[PDB]
Amino acid sequence: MDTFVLDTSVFTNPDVYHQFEEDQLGAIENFISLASHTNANFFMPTSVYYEFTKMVSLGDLAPKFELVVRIRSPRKWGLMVPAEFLYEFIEEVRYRINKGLRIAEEHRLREKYREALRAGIIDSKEDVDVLLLSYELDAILVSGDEGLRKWADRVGIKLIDPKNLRYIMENLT
Amino acid sequence: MDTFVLDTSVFTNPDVYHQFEEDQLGAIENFISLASHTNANFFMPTSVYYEFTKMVSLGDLAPKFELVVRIRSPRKWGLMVPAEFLYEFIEEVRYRINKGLRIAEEHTKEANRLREKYREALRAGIIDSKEDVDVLLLSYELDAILVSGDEGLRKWADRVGIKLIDPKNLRYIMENLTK
Amino acid sequence: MDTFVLDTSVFTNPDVYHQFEEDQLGAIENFISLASHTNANFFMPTSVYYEFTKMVSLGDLAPKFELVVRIRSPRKWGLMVPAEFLYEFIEEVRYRINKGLRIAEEHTKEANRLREKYREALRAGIIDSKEDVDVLLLSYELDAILVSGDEGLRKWADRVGIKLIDPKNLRYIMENLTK
Amino acid sequence: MDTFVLDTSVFTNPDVYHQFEEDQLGAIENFISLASHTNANFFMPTSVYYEFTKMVSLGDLAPKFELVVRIRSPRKWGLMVPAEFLYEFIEEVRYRINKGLRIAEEHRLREKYREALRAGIIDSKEDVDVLLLSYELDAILVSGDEGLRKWADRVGIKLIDPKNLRYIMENLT
């Protein structure tokens, strides 16, 4: 059985969700439908699912989604990880925090600095939840975020072109 | 054979180093003297020792300190550590960035400059979080007792299951461990 | 269950891909077709697949190719590899830098520019060496048969003990392995 | 027994070899002398020893040095190393090669480019020989090169302030 960890970008980036349907809620509905007939496991971190529910009005599709996708918190599960990954992660957060500062520079600036760095911290956390969950399960990471795909590849994690999730699932009935 | 990992706070916080002497470099020398004849192993992470050097002028004490205290990197390869250290790191970089921005506000008013001050406050914020991770990681790896005059770090150690002592008790324990 | 790691050369070198078809995208499609019904596992390192994409327009073949061929990163964590790969890497970056500087000379004469050309020739020189290390490393890790139309890489594989085949024989072996 | 891997800088950087003696050949002679009475092992990679003999006229001190220091080629010994170190090394070579290019830029430029990059390759090789030998033996790396010390620290290798080699050896009779 193939296991897949899904990012929010899967259902919020039209270049990805158009393979299911051009309509966003219909794309998700089609994903849910196909998943229930696919010989595969699907996981999404809890932080990422919280973001997904905050940005898309799922309505009745939420409890349907909760029948096909395992929503898990890799932090609350207490994983062990090689010390080299812990320092790779810190470099990734450092770099993300510096991006947040260059962003605040392009925009007193107190108000702009606090919000740019808070977003960069939250981005870092959700990314690590996605990479830890993939690592723990030895799963295929599916993401429309090229930056997270490069990060997953630096640490050996398996990927697909997220534009081929539907094609892959259909060849896994 | 009791093993200890030392924080900078032990030789920086006067509440902690007064147990050795009121004099700060006298406190360090007394600690060094006790560490010479002991059944105790003493460790400090490399990054923490660097900070120690920057905020204290050891002079001719540095070679003796580097001999009695084993300065090591916790970036070991075959070692597995709890993923909770990534989350501790995130939680601390958050609080230190918030503190850092409050401090760069004050300083820029007393003195462009605010861009350089905010940049400094966060580079320091990261350095301090990574230094705390080095301390907790080296304790975890060596199954050592963490000695820290910093309560924030102690609460974190307790969270991840690291053995602690009241740092005010270090000299009495070192006196026991003398050969 | 025979496992193979493919180089870009197999679908780029016409001496190798002619065994499938004279047509280059027909050769790739025939390979894909054979790989669909086999007791063979096919792998390609992620960095090598990227290069493949840049020098060939697969179009609607890409999703099928990414399904039959497993695109993986050889940056695995618990894995031990021979230190000889560091030395192979050094030896190749040497020769590729030397080649690169000869090529940037020629091109700048036909066309500042030479600073940009030398910079490009070495960034490509590094990329190509790291791509060769990804190929050999993924073979070593999976204990796979390396398939490469590049003789330089074959001599290197033989050095480190990696199993090889004559890449001109890939279609006949794939025909055997069909279910 | 403490094991030590020595860099060339130990005997070519006056800030380091002055602890033995202000005279360079006398500093080496004093090191050799003390080493023979120290309860410790001393190693130097063969590439680094070749550099050391090429830059200092050792004379009769060479065969004396060969009685106290093990000269070993970590490449010819066939080590195994975690895959994460192999990619850390490639980044270090990339960065070293880029330095070599920025150096050639500060100085047709063909002649200057070939020599700057050749030196950067050789620096990279000798550094990795020093770090591999330290890793294999679980040794203390001794080096006056701050860049190599930072590299060794990124990969968990043990260090000393090379200005304290003599003091350390004297407390290890």
Numbering used by the authors:
A (entry chain A), D (entry chain A): 1 to 107, 125 to 190
B (entry chain B), C (entry chain B): 1 to 111, 124 to 191
Task: Give the exact sentences the study uses for this entry.
One of the first steps of tRNA processing in nearly every organism is the removal of the 5′ leader sequence by ribonuclease P (RNase P). In contrast to other RNase Ps, HARPs consist only of a metallonuclease domain and lack the canonical substrate recognition domain essential in other classes of proteinaceous RNase P. We determined the cryo-EM structure of Aquifex aeolicus HARP (Aq880) and two crystal structures of Hydrogenobacter thermophilus HARP (Hth1307) to reveal that both enzymes form large ring-like assemblies: a dodecamer in Aq880 and a tetradecamer in Hth1307. These data all show that a monomer of HARP is a VapC-like endonuclease that consists of a PIN domain-like metallonuclease domain and two protruding α helices, which are thought to be responsible for substrate recognition. The active site is conserved among HARPs and PRORPs, with five negatively charged residues, predominantly aspartate, positioned to coordinate two catalytic magnesium ions.
We sought to better understand the structure and function of Hth1307 using protein crystallography. From the lower molecular weight fraction of Hth1307 discussed above, we first determined the crystal structure of Hth1307 to 2.5 Å as a dimer within the asymmetric unit. The homotetrameric Hth1307 assembly is generated through symmetry by two identical dimers resulting in a dimer of dimers. Each monomer in the Hth1307 dimer consists of a PIN-like metallonuclease domain and a spike helix (SH) domain. The SH domain is a protruding α-helical domain consisting of helices α6 and α7, which substantially contribute to the dimerization interface by forming an extensive four-helical bundle. In the tetramer, two dimers come together in a side-by-side arrangement, where the two dimers are angled at 41°. The tetramer interface is considerably smaller than the dimer interface, with a surface area of 589.5 Å2 between monomers, for a total of 1179.0 Å2 across the entire interface. The 5′ end of the acceptor stem is positioned in the metal active site, and the T and D loops are recognized by the pentatricopeptide repeat domain in PRORP and MRPP3 (32) and the CR-II/CR-III modules in human and bacterial RNP RNase P. This arrangement allows RNase Ps to recognize tRNA structural elements and select substrates through a molecular ruler mechanism. Upon inspection of the electrostatic surface of the tetramer, there is a positively charged region of the SH domain (Fig. S7, (38)) that includes residues R125, R127, K129, and R131, which have been confirmed to be necessary for pre-tRNA processing activity.
